[PDB]
Design a protein around this ligand. Structure first.
Ligand SMILES: CCCCCCCCC[C@@H](O)CC(=O)O
Ligand SMILES: CCCCCCCCC[C@@H](O)CC(=O)O
Ligand SMILES: [O-][O-]
Ligand SMILES: [O-][O-]
Ligand SMILES: [Fe+3]
Ligand SMILES: [Fe+3]
Lengths: 256, 256
C-alpha cells in the first residue's frame, strides 16, 4: 500500500524513508549557504549597515505578510478523507494558520526599531532580487500541488528561518545593542522563530512524506527537490544582493 | 472618513448603523423561512423519515466539509493594513479557521448515527436542489469580494445554522431518542452549533460593517442583501426538496 507512518522521533531524519533522507541530502548545500550566510553572521554581530538592514526588512515583508495566505491557498486544495496525508495537511494547516496571527505585527515592530515605517514596508522600494522569493511562493501556492507548495513554504522557508533567526540571536550582540526600553518589542519576531526545538518544519516534512508514501516516483521526488532548492536559492539570491549593497555602503564610509 | 467603530453590545442590531439594521430587516423573511422550517420542527421531534434524514446528512456534507475552505479563500483576498475592516477580517479568519478543525469529523459521527457511512457522504447521491448551496458558496468564495463572500457564509449560513441547530435541540426529543451509549457522539455537531450566545455571526457582521463603513453605496448594500438572501434561499430550496421527499415517504407508509 506504500503507506508511511512514523515510528521514530519527529525531529530526526532517520525517522523517515531513505528517499526523504536523500532529499534532505540533495538540498543540504542549497540550505547551508542560506542558513550560514555572511549576512546573518553580520546581523548577529550588529554589523549591518542602515541601508542593508532597511532593505532586508522591506524586502522580507511580502513573504512575511503573505505566509498565512500561502497556507490558506494550500488548505483550499485539500479534501476530507481523500488521502491520509491530505487529512494530516488539512488539520495542520488549520492549526498553523492561527499560529501566524501576530507574526506580521511583530515584523512591523522589528522594522520600526530600525526606523523602517509601515509606509516604507508598503512602498516596497527594493531591488527585484529581493522580491523573487515572494513571487515564487505565490506561484507555487497558486498553481502547484499541495505537497510541492508545502515543501516550498512550510518546510523550506520556515525550516531555514528557524536556523537563520537562531544564528542572528546566537551571541547576544544584536539584542544587547537595542536600548533596553525598545528591546523586547524589537526582538519579538526573531525570538518567536528562533526556538531550538521547532517541530514546524519537521511536521511539514512528515506531512510531505505521508502524502508521497514509501515509494514516490522519481519525478515527484525531483519536483520536491527542485521546489525546496528554489526556495533556498531565492533566499540566497536575496542575501547575495543585500551583501553587494553592504560592501558598497561600508566601503564608502571606510574611504570617507 | 465614514469609519465604523462599535460602541454597544456585539450581539444587538442597535449597535450597528441604520443601513445594517435595514439589511437585517430586508433579509428577515428569507432567514425566517429557513430557521423556522417545518423540516427542523420535525427533526426536533425525531419525526423525519430515514430517507430524508439520510438525504439531509449527505446533502449538507459538501458545505460542512468545505466551510473552512471558503474562509481560506477569503483570507487569500486580504492584505495587511490596507483597510481596518480588512485587518479585522484577516485576524478573525485566521482564528476561526482553527475553530472548525473537528467539525467535519463531528458531522461524520452524526451521519454514522443514522447509518450514513463515509462512503455515502463521499458518493453524494442526492438531488441537485441539495447541492446548489455548496456551488453558490464556492462561487462567491472564489469570485466575489471578501465582504460579500463573508456575508454569504460566516454571516448568513453560520447565523442561520446557530438557529436551526438550536431549534433541533430545543425540546430534548431528538437527543433522547438516541441510545445512551451513542448519544454524546451523535449529538456533538449539533451541540457545537447550538449555543445561545454565539458571537460568530455577529462578529462576521461587525467585520462586514467595518469593511463597508457608515455610508456604503446603495449598490454595495444591494450586493450584500442579494448574497445573504441567496444563501438563505438555497438553504430553503434544500429544505423544500427534503420535505417533498418526507411527505412521499410518510404517505407511502401511512397508505401501506
Ligand atoms: C531572505 C529571507 C527573507 C524572508 C524571510 C521570511 C520568513 C517567513 C517566516 C514565516 O513564519 C512568516 C512570519 O512569521 O513572518
Ligand atoms: C440546509 C443547510 C445544510 C447545510 C448546513 C451547513 C452548516 C455549516 C456550518 C459550519 O460551521 C461548518 C460546520 O461546522 O459544519
Ligand atoms: O511561522 O512562525
Ligand atoms: O462553525 O462552527
Ligand atoms: Fe511566523
Ligand atoms: Fe462549524
Amino acid at each position: 500500500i506504500d503507506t508511511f507512518s512514523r515510528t521514530g522521533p519527529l525531529m530526526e531524519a532517520a525517522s523517515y524513508p531513505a528517499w526523504t533522507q536523500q532529499l534532505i541530502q540533495d538540498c543540504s548545500e542549497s540550505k547551508r549557504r542560506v542558513v550560514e550566510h555572511e549576512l546573518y553572521q553580520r546581523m548577529r554581530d550588529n554589523k549591518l549597515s542602515a541601508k542593508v538592514m532597511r532593505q532586508y526588512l522591506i524586502g522580507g515583508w511580502p513573504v512575511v505578510e503573505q505566509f498565512a495566505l500561502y497556507m490558506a491557498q494550500n488548505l483550499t486544495k485539500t479534501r476530507f478523507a481523500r488521502h491520509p496525508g491530505e487529512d494530516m495537511a488539512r488539520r495542520w494547516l488549520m492549526r498553523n494558520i492561527r499560529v501566524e496571527l501576530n507574526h506580521a505585527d511583530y515584523w512591523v515592530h522589528w522594522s520600526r526599531a530600525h526606523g523602517v515605517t509601515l509606509e516604507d514596508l508598503q512602498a516596497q522600494q527594493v531591488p527585484p532580487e529581493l522580491h523573487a522569493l515572494s513571487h515564487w511562493c505565490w506561484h507555487t501556492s497558486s498553481a502547484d500541488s499541495l505537497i510541492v507548495a508545502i515543501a516550498a513554504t512550510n518546510y523550506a522557508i520556515e525550516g531555514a528561518t528557524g536556523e537563520w533567526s537562531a544564528l542572528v540571536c546566537s551571541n547576544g550582540i544584536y539584542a544587547a545593542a537595542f536600548p533596553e526600553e525598545d528591546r523586547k518589542r524589537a526582538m519579538k519576531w526573531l525570538k518567536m522563530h528562533a526556538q531550538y526545538d521547532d517541530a514546524h518544519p519537521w511536521e511539514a516534512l512528515e506531512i510531505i512524506v505521508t502524502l508521497a508514501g514509501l515509494n514516490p516516483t522519481k519525478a515527484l521526488q525531483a519536483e520536491l527537490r527542485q521546489a525546496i532548492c528554489k526556495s533556498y536559492d531565492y533566499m540566497y539570491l536575496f542575501l547575495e544582493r543585500c551583501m553587494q549593497q553592504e560592501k558598497t555602503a561600508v566601503t564608502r564610509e571606510r574611504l570617507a
